[PDB]
Structure formats: C-alpha cells, structure tokens
C-alpha cells in the first residue's frame with residue numbers, strides 16, 4: 280500500500296522567476312500537493328527555493344536533477360539536494376549501476392527517496408535511451424529501486440516498464456499535454472502524471488489543473 | 500589552430516565550501532587557467548560562484564552540468580548557465596540529437612560553447628554508455644559539435660573517440676589520478692586533462708599541480 284499524490288497529479292514547476300513560480304504554485308495548490316522542481320528554477324533562484332516551497336505550500340518536493348555523473352560526484356549532488364530539503368531526487372539510470380547506488384546510499388543515510396529515470400519522453404530518446412531502457416529498469420529492480428519515471432508519450436513503453444518494475448513500484452510519468460501524452464491513458468500504467476506547461480502557461484493554471492482532474496475523475 | 504588551455508590541465512573544482520574552493524583555486528592559478536565547476540560547488544554556494552571565480556582568477560569556466568533533459572528544459576538550463584557567465588557547458592549525448600541541438604542553439608545565441616560528453620570514465624559507463632559512445636560521437640560530428648569529453652580511464656576508447664571526432668576537434672578528458680588514468684598517456688589523444696581530487700585533496704595542491712605538469716613537460 281502506497282498513498283497516491285493528491286489527484287495523481289504532479290506539477291512540473293519550470294518557470295524561472297520566483298514570483299511567477301510562487302504565484303502559479305499557490306494557485307494550483309488546492310489540486311496538487313506534490314511539486315517537481317528542476318534546474319530551470321533552481322539555477323535561476325537558488326537551492327533555497329526548495330525549502331521555501333516546502334514551507335509556504337506544505338507540499339512534497341521532487342528535485343528533478345537528472346543526476347548523471349560518476350558515483351563520487353553523484354553522492355555530493357544528492358547530499359546537497361537533501362540538505363536543501365528535497366523529499367526525493369530523480370537520477371538517470373543510463374550511467375550505470377554504481378552511479379545509481381551512490382544516490383541510493385545517500386538517500387538511505389538521509390531518509391529520502393530516489394526516483395530512477397528509465398526511458399525519456401522526447402523524440403531524441405529513441406536514439407540511445409529507448410534501446411537500453413528495459414535493462415535500465417531491470418537494473419533498478421536489482422538495486423532495490425522502488426520509484427521510477429517513464430514516458431507519457433509512449434504508453435506501450437510505459438506498460439512494458441510497469442511490467443518490469445511490478446505493481447508494487449511507484450511510477451510517475453511526464454510528457455502529458457504539451458508533449459502529446461494523455462492524462463487518462465498514462466494513468467493506466469503510471470501512479471501519477473507530471474504536468475508542466477499545460478498548467479503553468481495556461482491563462483488560468485487553476486482551471487487547467489481542475490480540467491485535467493475532471494478528465495480523470497473516475498481514476499481517482 | 501586552437502590555443503591549448505594553460506599546461507593542458509583543467510582543474511575539477513568539486514569542493515563544496517566556497518572558502519576551500521577559493522583557496523585551492525587561488526593556490527593553483529599559476530599553473531591552471533581553466534576551471535571546471537560542477538553541481539557539487541554550484542548547488543552548495545550558488546550560481547554566483549561562476550562569476551566570482553571568473554573575476555577573481557581571470558580563468559575560463561566550464562560549467563559541468565551534464566545536461567541531460569528534454570530539449571525545452573535543456574534550453575532553459577543553458578540560458579541560465581550562460582547568463583551566470585560560464586564560457587562553456589557540458590552536455591550529455593545519450594539523450595539524443597534534439598536535446599543536444601537545443602543546447603547548441605542557446606550557445607549560438609549567447610556566443611558560448613558546448614562540450615559533448617561521449618563515454619564516461621567510471622566503471623558503470625560500461626553498462627549502457629560505452630556501447631552507444633561511438634554513435635554519440637558521430638552524432639556530435641553530424642551536429643557540428645567541436646568540443647568533446649571522453650575517458651582517461653580507457654585510453655583505447657579515447658583513441659577511438661579521437662578518430663571519430665578528428666584532429667580539429669577539441670577533446671578534454673577526466674579520470675586522471677584518482678580514477679586511475681595517466682596524464683601523459685591521456686594527452687596522446689586528449690588536448691587537455693581534467694584533474695580533481697589528485698589536486699584538491701592534496702596537502703599541497705600547488706605542488707600536486709606542479710608535479711603533474713613536470714611529468715608531462717615534453718608534451719607542452
């Protein structure tokens with residue numbers, strides 16, 4: 280048993296201005312309790328933005344840092360990220376098992392979680408990532424990873440990834456809306472959908488979030 | 500014709516405390532004019548550290564951010580990084596051509612450079628990256644990439660990557676010292692070596708740098 284994030288919907292907050300990011304996040308907080316913060320916001324406004332969001336909104340924070348370095352550097356990135364208050368960090372699987380294990384070790388030390396990114400949602404993912412993705416997922420299973428990221432834009436791939444990681448793993452999925460993925464279809468396989476632009480570029484982000492949730496009401 | 504970095508030696512400044520990072524960098528500045536700053540330092544001390552180093556030391560700065568996202572996010576990361584004053588940014592090739600092109604476009608807009616990371620130096624690189632690395636390098640060539648990163652720990656791989664990118668491309672190489680790579684052998688194929696721990700953890704970082712340079716004097 281694992282509790283769903285609110286409405287199975289995670290906000291990808293990739294606005295690069297603190298005031299805009301705070302405005303939109305506050306506007307959709309009644310619908311979303313889990314926010315993904317990545318480098319567009321962090322490199323513009325600083326790591327302190329993580330604790331600020333956590334305090335102001337009382338939301339979960341996933342640091343989407345696509346950690347993709349050697350083990351020693353990965354350990355340092357993870358430590359800094361958890362010190363900043365992130366609940367979880369997203370790590371690339373493609374650099375291999377030692378790089379992932381380094382992140383898992385720090386997460387264990389600090390009482391936090393790692394999400395393993397398997398296949399990516401964009402067209403370029405077909406070149407190198409897709410062919411390795413099943414094996415990346417199996418590596419995750421072998422390492423004891425319980426949380427995964429896979430692509431809304433390829434539900435047949437998402438289904439295959441779900442098959443590899445099992446029903447007990449937690450799977451979140453970006454590529455919904457702007458990149459062409461469908462909320463309902465994605466939630467056949469993923470526990471939660473990640474949505475950025477379709478919400479944060481909307482004239483009314485709250486209405487956009489509400490509309491997405493309405494379209495998946497029967498899956499909640 | 501391209502000018503070598505001073506002594507063909509790039510410092511990987513992965514200390515996480517500003518005072519320590521400034522001390523070590525200042526101590527070795529007579530030997531090294533090009534510094535690689537990554538997320539260990541940036542996530543601990545902020546993006547302002549890039550401009551501070553540039554001003555205080557008058558050195559080149561390579562932002563080692565292993566950029567590894569979708570095109571839209573990559574563009575944002577690159578813009579923030581060049582705004583912060585970085586001369587170049589390191590981008591992963593594994594996510595594919597569109598993701599790389601997004602970084603190249605921003606570099607072109609802002610008069611900066613992209614380095615393409617092909618094969619990595621750590622053991623886990625053997626699992627997925629190594630098998631794709633030749634094709635990643637060829638993709639770089641096709642995209643007009645002129646600057647590359649490849650592994651000191653596998654000189655036979657470094658040689659192959661040099662063959663693919665040609666003599667006119669600029670190639671820098673980490674994994675020297677701590678990870679087992681040899682300065683002189685690496686410089687048979689790479690234009691410059693990247694060195695972190697062997698310098699920054701030394702009792703006397705200046706002496707460590709001087710020693711490395713002494714060992715490769717005939718290649719300068």
Ligand SMILES: O=c1cc(O)n([C@@H]2O[C@H](COP(=O)(O)O)[C@@H](O)[C@H]2O)c(=O)[nH]1
Pocket residue numbers: 291293317343396398399400401428429430453454455456457458473474475476477568569572
């Ligand atoms: O495969 C992936 C993995 C991601 O983390 N992402 C991230 O998920 C978000 C997608 O946002 P959007 O809904 O605006 O397309 C972005 O933050 C992107 O960096 C992705 O798009 N595809």
Ligand SMILES: O=c1cc(O)n([C@@H]2O[C@H](COP(=O)(O)O)[C@@H](O)[C@H]2O)c(=O)[nH]1
Pocket residue numbers: 348349352511513537563616618619620621648649650673674675676677678693694695696697
């Ligand atoms: O394949 C690669 C690519 C890298 O950027 N690096 C980076 O180069 C540096 C190696 O530092 P060191 O000399 O302490 O091993 C680190 O900053 C690491 O993140 C690497 O080690 N291997």
